[PDB]
Amino acid sequence: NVWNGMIGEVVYQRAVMAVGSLTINEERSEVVDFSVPFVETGISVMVSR
Amino acid sequence: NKLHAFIWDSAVLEFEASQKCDLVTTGELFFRSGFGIGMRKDSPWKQNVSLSILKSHENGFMEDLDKTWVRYQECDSRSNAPATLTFENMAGVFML
Amino acid sequence: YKAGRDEGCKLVTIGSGYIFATTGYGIALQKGSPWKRQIDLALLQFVGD
Numbered sequence: 001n002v003w004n005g006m007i008g009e010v011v012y013q014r015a016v017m018a019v020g021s022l023t024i025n026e027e028r029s030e031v032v033d034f035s036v037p038f039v040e041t042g043i044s045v046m047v048s049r
Numbered sequence: 050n051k052l053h054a055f056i057w058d059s060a061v062l063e064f065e066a067s068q069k070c071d072l073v074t075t076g077e078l079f080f081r082s083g084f085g086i087g088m089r090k091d092s093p094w095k096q097n098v099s100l101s102i103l104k105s106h107e108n109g110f111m112e113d114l115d116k117t118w119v120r121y122q123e124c125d126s127r128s129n130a131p132a133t134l135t136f137e138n139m140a141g142v143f144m145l
Numbered sequence: 146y147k148a149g150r151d152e153g154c155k156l157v158t159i160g161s162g163y164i165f166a167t168t169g170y171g172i173a174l175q176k177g178s179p180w181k182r183q184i185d186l187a188l189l190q191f192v193g194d
């Protein structure tokens with residue numbers, strides 16, 4: 001029940017913002033307040049051709 | 050053939066192209082954006098609607114909606130391979 | 146990005162760009178942060194321009 005990482009820094013007021021490859025999901029958006037998604041991501045599978 | 054080109058959302062245009070044989074999309078998506086559920090600037094449903102949308106994205110509900118409503122295909126004939134000759138293509142030599 | 150920068154193009158994402166969770170990267174902020182509105186508007190302006 002303790003957040004670690006960039007979300008951990010934002011939650012515990014050690015950082016106002018967390019810029020980076022930060023994916024939006026339900027739990028994080030419950031614990032922090034995300035902005036508009038500025039790049040599309042999501043689960044994907046990469047295999048050798 | 051009254052309008053040469055129609056600029057519109059990727060989802061709607063791609064669905065129309067998949068459904069209709071005589072229509073085809075171009076490509077090179079621009080102004081990448083997303084459909085949102087608009088609400089007034091001071092509303093009580095803001096956070097809950099956003100969280101429900103995110104949760105439906107996390108599981109397969111939005112994938113199920115795409116499958117049932119957008120991701121079904123009637124006539125496509127879209128490939129990079131060279132076209133296969135058909136009756137009308139070489140009916141001239143048969144009549145010859 | 147890794148597939149684009151891959152050497153020899155031996156690695157590919159299946160489905161020709163198949164994305165499952167289709168979320169997006171966001172700028173994390175503290176709950177009820179006063180910067181959310183300005184950051185959202187700025188990001189949307191950047192996308193529009």
Ligand SMILES: *[C@@H]1O[C@H](CO)[C@@H](O[C@@H]2O[C@H](CO)[C@@H](O)[C@H](O)[C@H]2NC(C)=O)[C@H](O)[C@H]1NC(C)=O
Nearest residue numbers: 030088091092093094095096097098099100101
């Ligand atoms: C929005 O969602 C929140 C969280 O689910 C709701 O708040 C809870 O509501 C239930 C039912 O009234 C209560 O039993 C909980 O104690 C509430 N928890 C919190 C965090 O207050 C809220 O009712 C929902 N509705 C809106 C639009 O605000």
